[PDB]
């Protein structure tokens, strides 16, 4: 009694794929028998996706409802996971498993060996990672604040600074490392490793600040720096 | 000069949506002018999605290639993000922003206020969370090991224990809290809060162990417990 899996590989976002789970040793038509699909993201745990029973009863995980369908072909004694509208979050090793609902026993057994599905459209080159320091900081009105940002590559001076108040859209503070956006108070200044400096903190300046490189696409942001009251 | 945003809301996985960015104060046909879409997952930072320039030049983030398209209608002076094949990972507040490539200046300015897009098909009820303890542990051959698992609700005794060696499929150890799977050594035992006990660790027992409830759908797993050598 075993399940032979087939399919998978690399596929673009929005693409489609089908995985097969060939049942050996038993029959999917048998009463009590179900087939279940489980997936495991790289370096992560297990996540149940769908279960199909002998009586057409089916159950889906919320995140795959409307995207994945589960089925079984009797003539080939094979179970299928039809995966459409694929997204990066679907990158994982996908397992099929045999269920048996034959009053208190329902467990996944005789798993398939699993096959990786990777959803991507990019190359092997890394994107420029931006790191902000610190992630958080405390200050009082009138304080001097300095926030730093660092690029994983030489981005020259193509770096912007944004400010975001809670629940509001971001606002451009400084462009090209040091050029102050017109209408932004001159207490904000940018320098270069990159630093945003507030010379004397004001009540309206408590917010999250972001750096952003435009040296290359994709444009990337730092993780943000929240400046909070004391 | 401002950008008026419209659209968003709740939509099922695999569904489609369109966001509008109405340009006020300037014209998208102007040379040097671009429109950019940025999104911010709840409690997370900013992520660039796509940029459309006056000369039809376009650039996409890798994870939305093949799913999202960016465009602009001149007669309505509006920019559009056509979002198809939507996934849970697309839940975020989506911003449009005005780009200006008019030799070293390219920054997002005059952002729209943003609108939430949530991709979901479920209800307000929480799924049963399983917590394993500890996440990791050290031991030597011959040791006694106990691993615990806890359910966020009363799951009665509908709980299974699995074992996963690196690079291999999971294997059922114990079903219905205490029933030892046939062929599994009796040094493995399960009890009930839930505990998996190994009476005397053997070389083949170094692996990751998972609990799993089947009291309710969706079936949920614990985060796993890696048992590693000393």
């Amino acid at each position: 009694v075993q399940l032979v899996e087939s399919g998978g590989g690399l596929v673009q976002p929005g693409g489609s794929l089908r995985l097969s789970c060939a049942a050996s040793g038993f029959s999917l038509s048998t009463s009590g028998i179900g087939v279940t699909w489980v997936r495991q993201a790289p370096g992560k745990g297990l996540e149940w996706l769908a279960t199909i029973w002998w009586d057409d009863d089916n159950r889906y995980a919320d995140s795959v409802k409307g995207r994945f369908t589960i089925s079984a072909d009797t003539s080939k004694n094979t179970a299928y996971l039809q995966m459409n509208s694929l997204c990066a979050e679907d990158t994982a090793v996908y397992y099929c498993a045999q269920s048996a609902i034959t009053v208190t026993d329902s467990a996944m057994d005789h798993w398939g060996q699993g096959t990786l599905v990777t959803v991507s459209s990019g190359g092997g080159g890394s994107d420029i990672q931006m790191t902000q320091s610190p992630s958080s900081l405390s200050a009082s009105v009138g304080d001097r604040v300095t926030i730093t940002c660092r690029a994983s590559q030489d981005i020259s001076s193509y770096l912007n600074w944004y400010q975001q108040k809670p629940g509001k859209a971001p606002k451009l503070l400084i462009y090209y490392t040091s050029s102050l956006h017109s209408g932004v108070p001159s207490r904000f200044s940018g320098s270069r490793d990159f630093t945003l400096t507030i010379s004397s903190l004001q009540p309206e300046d408590f917010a999250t600040y972001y750096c952003q490189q435009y040296s290359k696409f994709p444009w990337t942001f730092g993780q943000g720096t929240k400046v909070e009251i004391k």
Side-chain angles (χ1 to χ4, degrees), chain A residues 2-28 30-43 45-58 60-74 77-100 105-125 127-134 136-164 166-167 169-215 217-225 227-229:
Chain A
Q2 58 184 10
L3 294 172
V4 180
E5 262 190 83
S6 54
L10 211 173
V11 51
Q12 59 161 281
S16 73
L17 264 201
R18 200 186 67 168
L19 313 180
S20 312
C21 189
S24 164
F26 73 106
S27 161
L28 306 183
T30 300
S31 153
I33 286 300
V35 185
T36 294
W37 286 95
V38 179
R39 83 179 167 198
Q40 186 171 39
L46 300 170
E47 170 182 32
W48 169 84
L49 296 172
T51 288
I52 181 168
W53 299 104
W54 75 104
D55 60 349
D56 320 308
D57 195 19
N58 52 84
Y60 288 99
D62 279 327
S63 67
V64 309
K65 289 193 184 110
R67 302 196 300 119
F68 296 3
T69 55
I70 188 171
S71 59
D73 178 272
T74 297
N77 205 40
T78 318
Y80 298 106
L81 180 65
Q82 180 65 250
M83 312 157 66
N84 302 275
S85 178
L86 293 169
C87 290
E89 84 196 51
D90 300 311
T91 299
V93 169
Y94 283 74
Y95 294 103
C96 65
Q98 175 214 39
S99 316
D105 308 331
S106 191
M108 289 160 277
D109 198 19
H110 301 118
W111 299 52
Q113 79 174 71
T115 165
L116 178 63
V117 170
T118 301
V119 182
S120 203
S121 84
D127 293 328
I128 301 181
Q129 154 156 77
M130 312 294 303
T131 314
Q132 280 187 241
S133 210
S136 190
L137 81 94
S138 34
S140 295
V141 168
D143 290 336
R144 164 176 192 98
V145 181
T146 59
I147 303 169
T148 73
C149 183
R150 159 171 47 93
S152 57
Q153 323 183 170
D154 169 51
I155 60 159
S156 155
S157 295
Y158 306 108
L159 176 128
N160 303 318
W161 285 102
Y162 297 93
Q163 173 198 74
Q164 183 173 43
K171 167 186 171 59
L172 173 60
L173 294 174
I174 284 146
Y175 64 100
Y176 197 51
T177 302
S178 294
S179 296
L180 177 68
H181 185 93
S182 148
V184 173
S186 40
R187 58 186 194 260
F188 295 89
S189 67
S191 75
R192 192 175 164 189
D193 210 82
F194 300 86
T195 291
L196 168 70
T197 306
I198 317 181
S199 62
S200 151
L201 200 69
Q202 295 311 107
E204 320 98 297
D205 298 338
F206 285 105
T208 313
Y209 295 82
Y210 292 94
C211 58
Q212 172 249 330
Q213 62 89 11
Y214 52 103
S215 159
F217 284 101
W219 293 348
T220 40
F221 296 86
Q223 85 275 0
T225 292
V227 186
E228 293 157 356
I229 322 154

